[PDB]
Write a protein that binds this DNA or RNA. Structure first.
Lengths: 342, 355
RNA sequence: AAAA
């Protein structure tokens, strides 16, 4: 754990995981032209860990120049260890060659099997779960900004989602548009919202508060999904479970409905339905695909959870985009367990 | 010279992975006698994409299974390949680093040629001798899409040029007519002026009431043209001009791209330096207040172009209407080139295509 | 093709 040599590239996670697990004295970061901002991401991700960071520039596609930099590093730090997981194959082949020639340890992080491979001796080790959500987001340039009676309604809405589909969808729309006075047919649902004090009659009905409006504006379903994951957390080791995280990189901001870490992979659920004529899921699928790839990277996992049934086309695009889909709140607990395992 | 290497070296060994392009480009350029495809478990569909991409160039194809994360086992398979085909050449661009390190090691030990495809500089690097060669441009749009499992399914030119040149001064009038055309509102008002005279003279609008208190489109094709179609033609016509000096390939408008499960419509696509270029230039999504809302379009561009064109694919968002700072910042964040100033588009297209 |  003396000197750790990392090759920086699009995905910093496999360089950061070993440094958080077992802090070395020194990290040598091999960065490439126009990517010095990756050095700053690496510092931000490892801020919690006292460690000296040395930066060295190499060309992504120059075998000989990478061989020369590794030779220089091994002269100055003979007890160096190489993380060969990052970089181009040119960078990685060059560095492997010089570290092998000097009989040095060489590690590769396999996130599929959650193992560190020791390429020098063929051995391996299970990874821990060292990452927080803060550290994971930092690797992608992102930082975070941010009643008893109503939980009962949330469970009844979830259990009755098929038969109250249209009424709840319509109330979501009304709440989204901030339409101050609205009609609702007499029935179990109107009685329930009146008894729960979510709606009151107009001097027609109105929401009893902005909080009540937010709750009917798909807020109930966001809390339902979060509350299933708190239950599931009791039996599966989900980490850093958070609702309504607001993340920025200084150029864009994204809101994420529910996020957690499991086996060092960020899991993102989209379960706000207030984007979307009705509800328009196609615009939501494109957003999930775009944002989750930028925020959670290639090993990140995305789910689209809905109280309203999705069309065949929407389900086919989700399958095509590797987005797990639940449009049956009755089945969500079982589906969350299936998704998390996988 | 790659044609030369494939006369002396009969057998091309490549490692299959998410991006088949760097294995396919050398095979289309210079067809070898035999290809050995190293595929991994649950990814036999990559063998089928490779066959489909190289259908125009039938060779002998041998398939061999390897584990993505087993160094010693990949070393043994490469040893076996080199025993049976001693004149093998390795394309080390594909695969995991474990696959690639294992194969490199055995091919280096046997003093074999080893190539790596650099799409940034458009070069084949010969890792055995430090030499390199410019790639050609034999790749078609059909072959490119096959690597990602996809298949491809009047008087008014004067008006088009005047709209492009006057986009700043007619911004609001043209935006408003785009909205009307999008909503299919059949009868509309227009202030008297240069623009009304132009549309009347071009026969794009005709009067609908006396005293020109109302107008209508002269046809559905006239409506389509006012529904941002004029700007789509402007963009395509800049690419025809540029084609006269730059080797843009397979320039297409309004392409339908499908796999088994999804279809995507794309405004303008071409190949340049073996990279797929996608332009979004359709104006058809408005709010209730008639403003364009670009954010939903940016997410679609980001999602579709990454699936259809892969990580080296290039996307641009072109508009005649000014975009908000936030929309421009999301485009920058998502590596989408953005133009909201038709006066600058030619220069921006040249910058974009040359990175 | 810069954790495949």
């Amino acid at each position: 754990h003396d000197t750790y040599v990392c090759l920086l590239s699009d995905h910093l996670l496999p360089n950061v995981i070993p440094v958080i697990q077992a802090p070395p004295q020194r990290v040598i970061l091999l960065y490439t032209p126009n990517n010095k901002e990756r050095v700053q991401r690496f510092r931000q991700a490892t801020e919690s860990v006292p460690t000296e960071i040395i930066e060295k520039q190499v060309h992504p596609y120059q075998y000989a120049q990478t061989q020369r930099i590794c030779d220089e590093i091994l002269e100055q730090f003979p007890n160096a260890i190489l993380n060969v997981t990052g970089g181009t194959k040119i960078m990685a082949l060059a560095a492997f060659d010089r570290f092998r020639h000097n009989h040095r340890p060489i590690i590769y992080v396999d996130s599929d099997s959650q193992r560190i491979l020791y390429l020098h001796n063929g051995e391996s080790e299970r990874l821990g779960d060292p990452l927080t959500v803060k550290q994971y987001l930092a690797c992608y340039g992102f930082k975070a900004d941010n009643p008893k009676t109503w939980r009962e309604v949330e469970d009844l809405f979830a259990q009755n989602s098929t038969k109250w589909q249209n009424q709840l969808g319509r109330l979501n729309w009304i709440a989204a548009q901030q339409q101050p006075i609205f009609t609702l047919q007499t029935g179990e649902l109107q009685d329930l919202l009146l008894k729960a004090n979510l709606i009151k009659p107009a001097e027609g009905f109105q929401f009893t508060s902005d909080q009540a409006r937010q709750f009917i504006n798909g807020g109930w379903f966001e809390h339902y999904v979060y509350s299933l994951l708190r239950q599931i957390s009791a039996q599966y080791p989900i980490k850093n479970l958070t609702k309504n995280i607001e993340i920025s990189n200084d150029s864009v901001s994204n809101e994420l409905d529910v996020v957690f870490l499991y086996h060092n992979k960020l899991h993102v659920i989209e379960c706000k339905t207030r984007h979307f004529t009705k509800i328009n899921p196609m615009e939501t699928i494109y957003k999930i695909d775009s944002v989750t790839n930028r925020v959670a990277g290639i090993k990140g996992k995305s789910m689209f959870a809905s109280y309203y049934p999705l069309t065949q086309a929407a389900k086919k695009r989700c399958l095509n985009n590797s987005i797990y889909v639940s449009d049956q709140p009755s089945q969500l607990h079982h589906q969350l367990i299936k998704w998390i395992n996988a």
